[PDB]
């Protein structure tokens, strides 16, 4: 979802997990500690956009 | 789409607990997979190819029956608004995606056992809020309810409009000509199962017509001589295996539309349905339509088991009530054969022969089932086949009324 | 910055432009919208979004009927005009005039 | 050079010609659908589109 | 009898009969537009300063409140004196168009479609052609609804007016207009809940329930959708608020949807506070109701809390203190602040997605639709009855003790005192002699 | 009048009144925090330590629990506090 | 790699190592006369300087 100026709703991470954390006993852990993270960014140029 | 449904859990036949084994659950709904469209994964074109003749699940209907009983232990959110656990197993998530053993840290409350529990969608708001993903539950719950409401055969609904078929249905049916009924039933189940649809959709009307045509041919009113817009079903020889039918299209004279719109509810009154694929497929196909469009009207309580009397949103005895008819296959077969002779398709000598063959065929089914019941007494804790008494095979039911309806349905 | 979360913290007599800029941004930043795609008959591969739906950073409309033409009430056009108007106000501010 | 021509549609064409240049600051209504204030003025050649 | 920071009296009160809708006759429409003065007839100034000749906030009325100004108007507002001149000009011109077609003597009896009229008028003063609408200005109320009369032409009429076989989509009109010199920061200015912005929301009228289902499926991914169940003005319709927020109303505790709820709740409270048996009203339940993207399980955001109160307000509850007829920014701020205070949420009536529960003992009377159903809370403390409000006192009050049969030991009395007393205190002597 | 009201809103966004009316404000912290506020400088560091229990310590000793340079104009050691005079 | 070693002071050394890096953002009072939060962590090699 596209959030807009809502500080508490800013999406910091998109996550994916290959294994069931319940088996590892990670049921109560921070989600970031249990799921992989995507990290990709593209540096566009304002001048072309304008 | 359709934002609401109502349901009813199964009845315990005097037994204290829902009748299914942990192995049945682990077998029929395990693997952490989604159980919401599996009703056809264990069906095929004919009994000859299926392991319905021995061991566990020794009947055509056995697996689906067990499925219905299984759900009755886990549909609490639509009854009390809360997910619960039963014998250490519960849903993985509020979306009810799949089942799993309970966690050790914060178990959900244990379900208090009960039977014939009425169900409302509104009791569980998250369902509507996630309707797009939780849609398949609607179909299965409806199917379970349609079976739970009746002893012997499940209940399904029929209707025929005063208008001719639209072209879309005509084109669609012209592509399903040579298909056996079992494959057709799968598509109908597959269609309504996996994503929300509006009742004003071509497939919905298409399947609606199919159920009508199937019944009309089942009663023998629709034949090579007389057809609905050219379509009709053909049944296999009783001398080999009558439990099979396929679609056909023909030059025959087209039946005229009824004077007024006709509709009713149906069920098989005799235990033969439990081991007869055409009945199971026909019911499931017809029930699929009601799943997407909801119940047109309350079902008449007059001829239903005790627990079905006056179920809210399902059964009634008032003015806005549609009667439900029932039949026995053997008298039905005799009527179908008689209609064939009157239409001139066969001679009197053949009609007598056909009755002898079908009766002999049905006898084996009865003989197989009755022996199977004592092999699986319901006191064992699981119900692979619905209980019955020996006299249940002899009931004529409302068969005479049934053929009369087809008489009025395809004039 | 706290002022960016609540422009009222910025005293007008201390930082006139910045307070105006914050208000301009909070008021004219476009509104995300939504539309559908694909066919429900075929299903969809959406994970978080409901199936056969797509989100869209700007407001959106159905396809027009007759010929198109430039317009001036779209969200982007409004964003452009207000932005230009603000900077013009900046250029005429006392800070520029002195130099 | 408007009145010198014999085209009956000369006046409306002259009017629309300026209207194109002022579409941004000064908007007006155009009767028939499918035509806008930025439509090339030379196309207004029908009595029903005045 | 308290919800978070809101205080409620134990008596229930609400009106008992609904006024039926009637469409506007063609002649009557011309009379309103031809009124020698349109103030108080087509619009009203909530802010007029008689010392000057100026106001800053205007409230609009049905023929006009459907308008959505083009942005060039918004970014450069005019003053009051220009406004009154501008309207009187446009009103007369619009009358001329309406009468150039449809001569009065042959059309005075016909009923105008309010939806078409609103859209047509709104485009007109937006300097946009309106010919497409004039063909369908009238409808026969005995044969169809203002909605179904339109769905005879299921296509995109214009870029801001799109109608399908079952539904119509159009931007919601601006109920308030801010003139030159508007300033939300001034706490005494009248509240507008952001409705002055041209595109604060969008409405979807629908003719039948399956259409309603179809619309919701499309909107499920966006912001929260709101709806009235009781009496949806011209017809059943959803509305989709703008996904942004509005400045000045709180410490940024707000999104647009919450604002619509909270002001709707206030109106519901105000009506309950002054409803009477002898007076019919257009609607018993003024509250909105969320139908998408909502959490019934949590109460840590304004939208959740407002909904939780609204479910109770429909029963006919009243606030312990009166709320202004024309609230200012300060008034709204106080209301929101109380609503966000720490406290328990009421749980007499559970939220349900698209059905509302009512107490049979409540004075409320359900309409014919399926959206309402009776319900029995186990320990509901309220009773039916009216309650009047007393003006404030200019003097500190004095009371005379009167006792129950209960009594308390000294130690409990002391420790209860020592943590509630202003133990060190500043005083004045006054004069003895 | 503008700054006073704004300062109140900050003080009430944290520390809701009904749970904190009885608490005593440290005058030193209050003075420093308010002074920075209308100097358009952030004050978050101060808000954590606005109150103190007068029966248990002095407004000074309540601060010396955090002996480090709080901000460029408010420096506190293990025994003393330095700040410009108002 | 802390618990793998046999040095009894290893836990304290591990703790101080982070404390050194956080001297600016999270200053604290190390109640040991003669030591500071910026003392090299590896030197905390005795009881009584814990």
UniProtKB/Swiss-Prot annotation, chain B:
Keyword Signal listed: no
InterPro entries: Sigma_1_2_reovir
Localisation per UniProt entry: Virion
GO CC term, one of those recorded: viral intermediate capsid
Keywords attached to this entry: Capsid protein, Intermediate capsid protein, Virion
Signal peptide: none
A family per Pfam: Sigma_1_2
Keyword ATP-binding listed: no
Protein task: Located at the interface of the incomplete T=13 outer capsid and the pseudo T=2 inner capsid, 120 VP6 subunits clamp and stabilizes the inner capsid shell.
Quaternary structure and interacting proteins, as annotated: Interacts with capsid proteins VP3, VP5 and VP7.
Family according to the record: Belongs to the reoviridae clamp protein family.
Protein's name according to its UniProt entry: Clamp protein VP6
UniProtKB/Swiss-Prot annotation, chains D, G:
Cell location: Virion
Family: Belongs to the turreted BTV-fold inner capsid family.
Function comment: Inner capsid protein that self-assembles to form an icosahedral capsid with a T=2 symmetry, which consists of 120 copies of VP2, with channels at each of its five-fold vertices. This capsid constitutes the innermost concentric layer of the viral mature particle.
Subunit structure: Homodecamer; each decamer is made up of two conformers of VP2, called VP2A and VP2B. 12 homodecamers assemble to form an icosahedral capsid. Interacts with VP6.
Entry protein name: Inner capsid protein VP3
Organism: Aquareovirus C (isolate Golden shiner/USA/GSRV/1977) (AQRV-C)
Gene: S3
Curated annotation (Swiss-Prot), chain F:
Leader sequence segment: none
Entry's localization field: Virion
SS bond partners: none
Family to which the UniProt record says this protein belongs: Belongs to the aquareoviridae outer capsid VP1 protein family.
Function: Outer capsid protein involved in mRNA capping. Catalyzes the last 3 enzymatic activities for formation of the 5' cap structure on the viral plus-strand transcripts, namely the RNA guanylyltransferase, RNA-7N- and RNA-2'O-methyltransferase activities.
The protein's name in its UniProt record: Outer capsid protein VP1
Gene: S1
